[PDB]
Coordinates of N, CA and C in Angstrom, one line a residue:
X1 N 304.9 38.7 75.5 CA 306.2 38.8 76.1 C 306.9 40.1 75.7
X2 N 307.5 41.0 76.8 CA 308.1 42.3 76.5 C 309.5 41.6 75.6
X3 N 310.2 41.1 75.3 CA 311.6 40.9 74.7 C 310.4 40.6 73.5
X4 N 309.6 39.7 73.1 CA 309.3 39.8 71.5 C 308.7 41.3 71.3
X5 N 307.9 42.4 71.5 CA 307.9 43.2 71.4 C 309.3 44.4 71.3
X6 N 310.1 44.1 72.2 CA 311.6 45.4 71.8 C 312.4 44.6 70.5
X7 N 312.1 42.9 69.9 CA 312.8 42.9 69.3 C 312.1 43.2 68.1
X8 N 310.3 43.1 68.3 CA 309.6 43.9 67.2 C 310.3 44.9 66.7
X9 N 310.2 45.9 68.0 CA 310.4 47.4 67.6 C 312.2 47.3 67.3
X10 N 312.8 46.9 67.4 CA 314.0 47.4 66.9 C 314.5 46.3 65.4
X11 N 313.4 45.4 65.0 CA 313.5 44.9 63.9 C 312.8 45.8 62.7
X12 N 311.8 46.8 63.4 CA 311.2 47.8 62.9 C 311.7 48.5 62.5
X13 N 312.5 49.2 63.3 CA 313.0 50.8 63.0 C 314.2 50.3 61.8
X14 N 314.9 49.2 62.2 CA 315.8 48.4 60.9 C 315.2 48.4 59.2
X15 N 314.1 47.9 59.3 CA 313.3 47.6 58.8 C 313.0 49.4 57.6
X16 N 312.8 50.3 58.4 CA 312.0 51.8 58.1 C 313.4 52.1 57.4
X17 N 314.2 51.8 58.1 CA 315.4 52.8 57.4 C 316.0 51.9 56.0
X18 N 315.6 50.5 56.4 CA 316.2 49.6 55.1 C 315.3 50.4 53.7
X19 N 314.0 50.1 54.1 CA 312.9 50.7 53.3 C 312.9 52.4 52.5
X20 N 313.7 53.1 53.6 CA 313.7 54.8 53.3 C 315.0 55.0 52.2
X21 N 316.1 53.9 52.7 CA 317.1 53.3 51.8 C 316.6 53.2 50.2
X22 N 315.8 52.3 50.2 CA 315.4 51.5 48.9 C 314.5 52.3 48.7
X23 N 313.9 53.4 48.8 CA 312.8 54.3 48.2 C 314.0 55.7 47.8
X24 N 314.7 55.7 48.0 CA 316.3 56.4 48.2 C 316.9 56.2 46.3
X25 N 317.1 55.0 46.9 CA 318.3 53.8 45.5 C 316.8 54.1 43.9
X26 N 315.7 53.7 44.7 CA 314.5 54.1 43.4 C 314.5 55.4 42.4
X27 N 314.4 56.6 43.4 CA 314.5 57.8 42.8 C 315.9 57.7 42.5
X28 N 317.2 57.3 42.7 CA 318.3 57.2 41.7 C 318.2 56.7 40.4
X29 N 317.6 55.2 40.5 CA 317.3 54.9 39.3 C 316.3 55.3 38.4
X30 N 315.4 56.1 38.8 CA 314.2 56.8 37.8 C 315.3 58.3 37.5
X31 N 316.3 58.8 38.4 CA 317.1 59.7 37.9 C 318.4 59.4 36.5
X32 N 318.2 58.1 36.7 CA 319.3 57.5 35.6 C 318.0 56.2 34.6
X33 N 317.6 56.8 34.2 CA 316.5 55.8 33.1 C 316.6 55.8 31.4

């Protein structure tokens, strides 16, 4: 079904930036150890 796929992809891109976030917040905390 095309709708489960666009809500793939835009649960994805959610998803990348939550992740690029939290690899973000990591190097803060290895900056404060």
């Amino acid at each position: 079904k095309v709708n489960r796929s666009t809500a793939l992809l835009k649960s994805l891109s959610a998803e990348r930036e939550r992740w690029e976030k939290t690899s973000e917040t990591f190097k803060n905390q290895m900056s404060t150890i």
